[PDB]
From a paper:
MT-bound complexes of Pfkinesin-8B-MD in the absence of nucleotide (NN) were also imaged and used to calculate a reconstruction with an overall resolution of 4.1 Å with resolution in the kinesin motor domain of 4–5 Å. The NN Pfkinesin-8B-MD reconstruction is very similar to that of Pbkinesin-8B-MD, including the empty NBS and undocked neck linker. In both Plasmodium kinesin-8Bs NN reconstructions, there is an additional connection between α-tubulin and loop 2, which protrudes from the β1-lobe of the motor domain and appears to adopt a partially helical configuration. In both Pbkinesin-8B-MD and Pfkinesin-8B-MD, density corresponding to loop 2 is clear, well-structured and contacts the C-terminal end of H12 of α-tubulin. In the NN reconstructions, the overall MT-binding footprint of both Pbkinesin-8B-MD and Pfkinesin-8B-MD are essentially indistinguishable from KIF18A_MD at the resolutions of the available reconstructions. Overall, the configuration of MT-bound NN Plasmodium kinesin-8Bs in these conserved parts of their motor domains are similar to a number of NN states of other plus-end directed motors.
Numbering used by the authors:
A (entry chain H): 1 to 44, 47 to 360, 369 to 436
B (entry chain K): 1 to 347
The structure:
Amino acid sequence: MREIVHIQAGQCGNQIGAKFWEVISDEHGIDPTGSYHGDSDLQLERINVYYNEAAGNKYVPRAILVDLEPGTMDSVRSGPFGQIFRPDNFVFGQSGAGNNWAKGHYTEGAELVDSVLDVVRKESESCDCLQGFQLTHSLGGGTGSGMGTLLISKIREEYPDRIMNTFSVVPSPKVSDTVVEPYNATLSVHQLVENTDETYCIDNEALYDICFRTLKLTTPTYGDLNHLVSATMSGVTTCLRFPGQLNADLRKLAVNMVPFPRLHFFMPGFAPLTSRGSQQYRALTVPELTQQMFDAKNMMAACDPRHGRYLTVAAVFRGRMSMKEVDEQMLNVQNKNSSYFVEWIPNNVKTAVCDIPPRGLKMSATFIGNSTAIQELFKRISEQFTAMFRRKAFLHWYTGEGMDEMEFTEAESNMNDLVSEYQQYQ
Amino acid sequence: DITYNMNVVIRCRPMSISEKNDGAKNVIKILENKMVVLLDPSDNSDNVLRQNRSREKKYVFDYVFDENSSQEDVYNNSVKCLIDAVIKGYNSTVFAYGATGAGKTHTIIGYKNEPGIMMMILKDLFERIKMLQIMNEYKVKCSFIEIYNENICDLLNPSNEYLDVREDPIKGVTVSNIFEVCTTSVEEIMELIHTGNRNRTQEPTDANKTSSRSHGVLQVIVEETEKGQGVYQQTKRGKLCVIDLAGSERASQTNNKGMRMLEGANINRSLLALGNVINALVLRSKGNSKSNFIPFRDSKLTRLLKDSLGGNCKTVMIANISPSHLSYEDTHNTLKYANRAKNIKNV
Ligand SMILES: Nc1nc2c(ncn2[C@@H]2O[C@H](COP(=O)(O)CP(=O)(O)OP(=O)(O)O)[C@@H](O)[C@H]2O)c(=O)[nH]1
Ligand SMILES: Nc1nc2c(ncn2[C@@H]2O[C@H](COP(=O)(O)OP(=O)(O)OP(=O)(O)O)[C@@H](O)[C@H]2O)c(=O)[nH]1
Ligand SMILES: [Mg+2]
Ligand SMILES: [Mg+2]
């Protein structure tokens, strides 16, 4: 009961997905072969949420891997945990998208997509009651953004009543990796606005800050960064996988955190986060976790929560904890930091608690905030788009893939509207 | 510059023979043109209830039409000036509203029979326009679309299937691939629309044999130019828009069909979106402190209607209710919505 379907689109998305799978298999006591070697019966009770049971006491991720390039697939298959995936669930093209949203959405991606659709239909049929979909990808390139968006549109058309979740790695302001990133982000964000029910805005710059400042990590690799994201992902759906004292799944979270249809862009966070040295000089207690989570410098989106207000915040706690203590701490934070919370939604905080902690830790926390500061992310992007579009820079490539200028105009308008709406509700 | 103007009227249907045969009591009384009272049929057994007298539930309107009102009377005393606004180069919008089964389609649009005010709207439009045509050539174009599960059906020409909305240079809204018929008479547009009704998604629900599952949106464009076609012209394209709002639904207790539950939710959501858009437009028109974005984005209905709703336009909400206590709850909710559509405490 309550099966989730996982989709990974483009290189980054795939990489994050791999990490996610690795963590979750470890959590549920699943080895690199698909066999259960755990101790606790609780690890297998709700195994069906993320895994299909294959013949001969093995488990396989309900995961679809998508890319316009084959190399990524190979890299995944050769990775630790690569062999756990169903071979028929790898759907790859041969060409690539060349950082072009149009190639991913209209051309190469279009050709690819039917196969993916066929796979995912089968995966849906297999599951007794699919609660919904989780897509991991980025907005800045061509595949994850254009192809991903296309896929999402198709999915929603066939499953309009199911929950649609995306973990979207967004382009940061300073660390600009590509030149057409503004275009790709703009086009994809628009589509996300209409077709996702909740969107987790993850930002590389913020991750780097976390790694450098909070973990004090000498050399971050993408794997390390990805780990953080994976942890966050695991946090959200802990209530579907384990028992607890107060239980909240994907739907319950959405209903409590989304007051208006369009405002479904979250700034996620995780706690605790310490170095090796600073491990000894700390208190493993709920007050400390709470303190950590609400800090601006612990957000995985490059936005200052102190530049806006929290519309709603959901906190998900894992480990053996006193409910009273949890409640006290959340009330204290809202009373003390009154100015950071919208005053016309009393009790801006939703709490959920799962008894099963993550491995290595006795207590852990996951944060989901709907903050009006997310407007900053959109605004910058809009500005950059304007700067490009005013001089029609790089437009020709997109137009060569069948895209028309008017779409760009529309998307930009839409994003502007969204920004305005956030501002006004602040 | 939101200068939004919306009149709110309501038509009380005459109590039907079926309602009389079923013992219906008269919950609806009209005290004035400006107001209607719905007599909530409480048993009043408690002293508190007898003291409060909650039975007298008042709602605020510009013109409440009683049980004897006809299609011609609704036209003459409500949309008549909206037609004029279009003739004069402005946009205007009419919204039919009520619980499904309320008779919205027949009062406003018709379906071969019961011409509705839509016939009357076009009948005067074309008489005035044909006269004006002597100096200013007119092209009265007509489209008819279906807004269903946020997708748009071309009703006049179903071969375009389900369409999206796009922003124009100068950001008005166009439905892609919609058929536009240039007409000269009400007979042409009325038959065109009634034929188009054949392509609407409708189902035999418990509350209504013909319950619309969608918002039927008429877009009649009164395009004009001085007949001196070789001269530069500041032409007009006033749009006379009429919306058959999907009926409100709370029949999901028995409508357990997957699609009816989907449609129901989308209908109610978009009816509420319209409500929120209206509240915002009214607040801005009033000049309140609520300076913000009008949430036209909340539905395809409102995104499209933005072009008339946010400007120097005349709009009208025409609700449909019943005097019978047997449907008190539907009349109550219908009146409540309409009251909130107006947002004026004159009653
Ligand atoms: N947080 C992470 N970000 C990544 C990772 N790999 C790439 N990226 C970021 O994503 C962007 C590059 O995206 P992709 O390689 O996924 C583009 P994709 O392969 O999906 O389509 P193509 O345009 O066909 O290459 C850029 O901002 C990178 O800095 C990762 O492992 N973690
Ligand atoms: N006294 C007490 N209250 C509880 C307990 N568990 C949850 N609550 C309270 O119950 C309310 C939340 O409702 P739940 O019972 O968890 O929700 P539910 O009935 O399962 O409804 P859904 O999960 O929304 O389907 C809150 O006021 C909690 O504080 C408990 O063990 N004891
Ligand atoms: Mg790639
Ligand atoms: Mg419950």
